[PDB]
């Protein structure tokens, strides 16, 4: 090492000074952000009575954890169609809005559920736009949701005045024009009620039993984060040289603790050089003291 | 409101035991049968139904692998089987059936059967 | 899933006095008045008394009266008598883990 730090192959006596002297860190720890309220995502996914397809939910949900692993086992989903986004990296994504929404349909409208659709439910009772981001989910619900008798339980509207606009709901009750007599309400012949109802019944094969249908909207703009992913891997260490994947300091000492009064309300420490020697600990709330090699 | 079932029994621990609940007496707007089994001197604890004329069980966290359900060929009565008896699981069992389809509150119920483990 | 609160354990209190019954579920978007009240006298099984948000089964006496919406539930009964000392529990069938309340034991002085 001498030799090549002076680059010559013979070297007079004396005493010379040759590279540095440091010991290389270990292992690897990491933490998640101080959010801790976990997402009650079992109203969406499991509700005992659905409103119709025109009285559709926009319902807003945040303000928590949400926990995407744990929903597999709420219901039978075998789709999980994804337009924006891989279906395998919804946890580790921090979103400031979640938008949930559901509504009962028929079977033979549920693939018309997509950007680009048009038609009978793409037009009159359901449109998304163009630039949409996300994920759909749908499922089978013939067992709990159709009478062999006949349900009228759910509506749909089939006359409109026209294509209404995404992300919105039409609730309007009135008999359509659809000819010259003046269709002032009630019924009457060129004057039909748009309202017709479902007949769901386990005769009916695949396309005309009732499906269950839920997407979840988000976007990606720049506002701060409001729901976030969870994860632990590594506890902690206490006497190592490791890596740090923590709140704000991706440090690499040997911290211990911290046996000073530290005041509530603050986190980092520093000191006159503005180096920083403690950490907020998210679980414990316990002071860390970082202390190099 | 005043539904029949089987009587009071005494069951050696680990045999089984035998529990009915006549519906036939009335005309019902439900597919869905329920059963309730009440603690000595605790609350009630829900352990599950079965669909009437399909026979698939419905079992609950802790109420699955010893309980059994059944129905009758008419489908018109209920059975409630439990196997592998222990002292503490002794308890008064109950039959209900709900009102209105979709509507999920118990408005008729059974006598109630009250089996005893112990020697 | 949900772990259904009942408070006071129990209660007794003079016949004629109308008990105020707190039936708070952990619902964190509501259960939308989907409640159903349940006496269980000793012995026979239990009875429904009041389904929905207010309104009472065919047969039930006017006295058992229940109120509440999404959170927070209480059920008033106006002039105890001694035929009503039994067991009150509270259902919520909102989603679908099927479960009770705790139970207060009502007692007859």
């Known amino acids: 090492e001498t030799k090549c730090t002076l680059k010559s192959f013979t070297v007079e006596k004396g005493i010379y000074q040759t590279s540095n002297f440091r010991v290389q860190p270990t292992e690897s720890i990491v933490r998640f952000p101080n959010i801790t309220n976990l997402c009650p995502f079992d109203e969406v996914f499991n509700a005992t009575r659905f409103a119709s397809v025109y009285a559709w939910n926009r319902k807003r949900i945040s303000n928590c954890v949400a926990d995407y692993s744990v929903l597999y086992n709420f219901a039978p989903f075998f789709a999980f169609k994804c337009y924006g986004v891989s279906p395998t990296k919804l946890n580790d994504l921090c979103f400031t809005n979640v938008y949930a929404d559901s509504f009962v349909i028929r079977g033979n409208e549920v693939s018309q559920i997509a950007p680009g659709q048009t038609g009978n439910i793409a037009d009159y009772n359901y449109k998304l736009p163009d630039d949409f981001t996300g994920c759909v989910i749908a499922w089978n619900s013939n067992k709990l949701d159709s009478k062999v008798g006949g349900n009228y339980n759910y509506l749909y509207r089939l006359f409109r005045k026209s294509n209404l606009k995404p992300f919105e709901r039409d609730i309007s009750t009135e008999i359509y024009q659809a000819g010259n007599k003046p269709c002032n309400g009630v019924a009457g012949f060129n004057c039909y009620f748009p309202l017709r109802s479902y007949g769901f019944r386990p005769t009916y094969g695949v396309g005309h039993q009732p499906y269950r249908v839920v997407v979840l909207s988000f976007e990606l703009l720049h506002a701060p984060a409001t729901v976030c992913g969870p994860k632990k891997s590594t506890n902690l260490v206490k006497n190592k040289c490791v890596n740090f994947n923590f709140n704000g300091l991706t440090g690499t000492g040997v911290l211990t603790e911290s046996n000073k009064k530290f005041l509530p309300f603050q986190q980092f420490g520093r000191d006159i050089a503005d180096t920083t020697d403690a950490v907020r600990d998210p679980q414990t709330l316990e002071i860390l003291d970082i202390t190099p090699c | 409101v005043q539904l029949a079932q089987s009587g009071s029994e005494l069951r050696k621990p680990g045999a089984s035991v035998k529990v009915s609940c006549d519906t036939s007496?009335?005309?019902?707007?439900?597919?869905?049968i329920h059963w309730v089994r009440q603690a000595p001197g605790q609350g009630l604890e829900w352990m599950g139904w079965?669909?009437?004329?399909?026979?698939?069980?419905t079992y609950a966290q802790g109420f699955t692998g010893r309980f059994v359900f059944s129905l009758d060929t008419s489908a018109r009565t209920a059975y409630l089987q439990i196997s592998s008896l222990k002292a503490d699981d002794t308890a008064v069992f109950y039959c209900?059936?709900?009102?209105?389809?979709?509507?999920?509150?118990?408005?008729?119920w059974g006598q109630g059967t009250l089996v005893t483990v112990s020697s | 899933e949900v772990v259904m609160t009942q408070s006071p354990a129990s209660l007794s209190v003079s016949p004629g006095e109308r008990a105020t019954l707190s039936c708070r579920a952990r619902?964190?978007?509501?259960?939308?008045?989907?409640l159903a009240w349940y006496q269980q006298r000793p012995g026979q099984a239990p009875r429904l008394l009041i389904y929905?948000?207010?309104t009472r089964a065919t047969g039930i006496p006017a006295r058992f009266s229940g109120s509440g919406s999404g959170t927070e539930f209480t059920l008033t009964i106006s002039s105890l008598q001694s035929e009503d000392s039994a067991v009150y529990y509270c259902?919520?069938?909102?989603?679908?883990?099927?479960?009770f309340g705790g139970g207060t034991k009502v007692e007859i002085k």
């Open positions: 259902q919520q069938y909102s989603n679908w883990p099927l479960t």
């Open positions: 209900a059936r709900e009102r209105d389809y979709s509507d999920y509150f118990f408005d008729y």
């Open positions: 007496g009335h005309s019902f707007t439900s597919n869905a």
């Open positions: 079965i669909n009437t004329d399909t026979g698939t069980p």
């Open positions: 929905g948000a207010s």
């Open positions: 619902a964190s978007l509501g259960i939308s008045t989907d």
